Structure 1
């Protein structure tokens, strides 16, 4: 310490031992003159807080930490964003899926079904865990319109759907059917329902995470999940409720009558429904088999061979609307020594990093009353949303709203990076820069604030 303290500035007098320099954006004189063309994630600040000098002029003067000692400063920072759930940047507004795009009776008498991969995009915005799903299903439909239908494609065969129920709860081990005649619409994790000849790929989208279907060994570029993959676990068919109902015309310890009332002339059972009001085909494999051609991921993962099925190369897990906690990197190139192996440069997308921190986004959870409220309004017929374009379908229906939805929420992060080594000649104008994992500014930054407290560390 002794003679090694002195923190000096032009004529303003000797200041001794730690003090404070401030890195701020909202400084009025600065804006107008320096970072006009820049944004909150990469700006310039005049660190000289002296009322009497031009910003330019200030950019000349310097804060001089005493020369005789190696100095260090404590860097506390306040980061605040407002990035939305889905958007083009975080890759949460795009996702490739393969759908039916044409259906025509080929030249002889056999038929033709051609499929193709199309990229659907969502309208940017901050959504729910669910409404997002919906937005996706809609984006599938919206395409079926501009193309599908007007080429022999019947809704009765739209290839991909993102639903959320266990399509085999009512299932009866012997009848081979979902007895209650209705797939019990309770929500149990996002799922993916495919059809023959198609599938979906998330190779370039974090939406995968929103669904909560993660690859069992991530560092593998590429995420395609097709029909052939979802093996074992095709949605069983609903039993014909009416056919069954309409039919039926042609120890001794109180356990006596209970054992005789519980027990050629066959019944209407066997009849697995085939279509629904407005006759929508449920595409059943055989006029025999109780299983529909529709295949569910959830079903696969949980019910089909664990050592071979998707349960093998994939992993079932929690949703997370945020799509993935990603971090950001601070850099104060003009004011702090470049950490260990970092090379010193001027290429904004490669500056040295002084602090890392998670991008300020959490997921708040709320209890959903609207879960059932809706089961008592479409049972009492009325208009439809662009979401339930197939009310009477039990499959292309509208995935049940899960109780407890999550919502991406932005929050101020009063973080604190360690104490770093800094130069002893701090320039009048410092440059602040926040970067993301991929190394690029981040448009969604409303406020960055830095406070540095230099203090002597050793001697030269």
Structure 2
């Protein structure tokens, strides 16, 4: 009693609790205060009077009674609109080393190699469309450079797939008896040729691919052909010239796909030159193999969970260890939260396989390695859900100006342009005495 008053400058005093509102779409503030800013770094009035312009309100004060220490419970509402794939989050780029300029000598077919750093479009996509775009990003550069030089279609260098290339592998024939690979999706996978590789440093799509490192805190992430020891894809069986002895045994592999395209068969007739991550991870040497420093995980279409920080640097006192400043780079933090991003799953029956027109994501329909990958029966997609959050009680400043700054930041201390709603409610109460 007595040490519990709340005084505005000309109106009846309240006592022991009230509310304060921090909305972002008041007309007078749209007009004057906020012309060169956005919903994540905005400026609002705590006075709701409309006898006063916001400029005039900026000089007014709310006065919480000295002889008491006050605290405020903070609640927040937030709603977002960010896409899965974008440049802001570093989720539309990756690097790859591929082959160029297959010319004959003047021993056999000298070859050049280099890195290129691809880019792909922007939008919100499922985890199947993303793979297709990543493949088209390589095919486009092929058509740009390697087609006009002497590179062929059977020797590209990199592909993203979902299949297990070991089903149907009788260990007397040492080949794939059906003469075809299984058209079922298990888990995404990289396949490579010699002299080529992939780098997801300064990128994020590795989490979508379910490939991760056992020591994430080192430098970066690079896979080369020389690290996939044990992942050689077995060759197929020559069924076409098989019944001629079966109507005394003809067991040779295939070489072409009826379009003069080599399978990169080796000197022996048991397996090909294409290597694979899944096979080396599951079937290769676990000690001297890539399993020693990589890890298989589920696909995360959201491309990683990330947190946000709230700041109100004219209402709350600074928490411990934070400096007082006026740079948007580092304001003090009053609350932490996760991006309101969630995966949702769906069933995909499809009851139909190997549809084949000349669809752009299936340019190579006859070849069982370059065919379009099969789709999972479980589709996954990212969605934005509004977030209602209680942040607890923080200490308040004794005097409160009528104009307040509201800020939301990401982990790297950059404002997020994908916030279009941010409401705040503050409920002050007495915490102690200073008498």
User: TM-score scaled by structure 2?
Assistant: 0.98
Give 2:388's aligned residue. 414
Give 1:114's aligned residue. 112
2:258 matches 1:268: no
Give 1:258's aligned residue. none
Give 1:360's aligned residue. 340
Shift of 1:179: 1.1
> What SS class does the counterpart of residue 380 from structure 2 fall into?
strand
Shift of 1:246: 3.1
Aligned length: 434
Give 1:319's aligned residue. 299
> What SS class does the counterpart of residue 102 from structure 1 fall into?
strand
Give 2:279's aligned residue. 299
> What SS class does the counterpart of residue 140 from structure 1 fall into?
helix
- Which residue among 339, 352, 362 is the counterpart of 1:373? 352
> What SS class does the counterpart of residue 273 from structure 2 fall into?
strand
- Cα distance in 2 between the residues matched to 1:18 and 1:102: 76
Q: Show CA shifts across 1:280-320 (max 9, x none).
A: 1110121x231111011011111101112111100000001
- Cα distance in 1 between the residues matched to 2:313 and 2:239: 72
- Which residue among 342, 345, 349 is the counterpart of 2:322? 342
Give 1:285's aligned residue. 266
Give 1:150's aligned residue. 148
Shift of 1:177: 0.8
- Cα gap change, 1:236 to 1:10, in 2 (>3 Å): same
Shift of 1:369: 2.1
- Cα distance in 2 between the residues matched to 1:289 and 1:311: 27
Give 2:66's aligned residue. 67
Give 1:223's aligned residue. 221
Give 2:6's aligned residue. 7
Give 1:444's aligned residue. 418
- Cα distance in 2 between the residues matched to 1:329 and 1:245: 69
> What SS class does the counterpart of residue 159 from structure 2 fall into?
coil
Q: Show CA shifts across 1:54-111 (max 9, x none).
A: 011111111112222121111110111010011001111001111112211133x542
> What SS class does the counterpart of residue 235 from structure 1 fall into?
coil
Give 1:257's aligned residue. none
> What SS class does the counterpart of residue 179 from structure 1 fall into?
coil
Structure 2: gaps spanning 5 or more residues: none
2:402 matches 1:428: yes
- Cα distance in 2 between the residues matched to 1:102 and 1:332: 59
Give 2:33's aligned residue. 34
Give 1:135's aligned residue. 133
Q: Show CA shifts across 1:202-258 (max 9, x none).
A: 001110000010111101121101110111111111111212233225xxxxxxxxx
Q: Give the alignment's Cα RMSD to 1 decimal.
A: 1.2
- Cα distance in 1 between the residues matched to 2:102 and 2:415: 46
> What SS class does the counterpart of residue 156 from structure 1 fall into?
coil
> What SS class does the counterpart of residue 216 from structure 2 fall into?
coil
Structure 1: gaps spanning 5 or more residues: 250-264
Shift of 1:374: 4.1
> What SS class does the counterpart of residue 207 from structure 2 fall into?
helix
